[PDB]
Amino acid sequence: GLALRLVNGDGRCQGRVEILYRGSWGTVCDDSWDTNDANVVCRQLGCGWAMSAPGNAWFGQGSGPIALDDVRCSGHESYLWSCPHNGWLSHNCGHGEDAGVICSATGEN
Ligand SMILES: [Cl-]
Ligand SMILES: [Mg+2]
């Protein structure tokens, strides 16, 4: 069962992006980690909208195989794994590129 979390931030609605894929939490190393991408993360978590998308392991480096690399959300999607992307677990990037998000945390549902 796919799941998403933001870790090592100040609260549920900010931190390093991690996706539960086939039993292990994996990070995102997108070098075009954009507002549209972050907005999808925030919507999916019920965390409002993306105030910023901190880059390059701002919230620290994750560990283990990296789940997603080039994720190109339109910005409307309900889940990050619904955005166009260039594959699971097939990436040469390092955890120094792990993406992060800071959401408004203005959701109530
Ligand atoms: Cl980051
Ligand atoms: Mg992107």
Numbering used by the authors: 99 to 207
Q: What are the paper's exact sentences on this?
A:
The salivary scavenger and agglutinin (SALSA), also known as gp340, “deleted in malignant brain tumors 1” (DMBT1) and salivary agglutinin (SAG), is a multifunctional molecule found in high abundance on human mucosal surfaces. The first 13 SRCRs are 109 aa domains found as “pearls on a string” separated by SRCR-interspersed domains (SIDs). The SALSA SRCR domains reveal a classic globular SRCR-fold, with four conserved disulphide bridges, as described for the SRCR type B domains.
The domains were purified by Ni-chelate and size-exclusion chromatography (SEC) and crystallised, and the structures were solved by molecular replacement. This yielded the structures of SRCR1 and SRCR8 at 1.77 and 1.29 Å, respectively. The fold contains one α-helix and one additional single helical turn. Combined, the data from SRCR1 and SRCR8 are thus valid representations of all SALSA SRCR domains. Both SRCR1 and SRCR8 are stabilized by a metal ion buried in the globular fold. The placement suggests the ion is bound during the folding of the domain and is modelled as Mg2+, which is present in the original expression medium and in the crystallisation conditions of SRCR1.
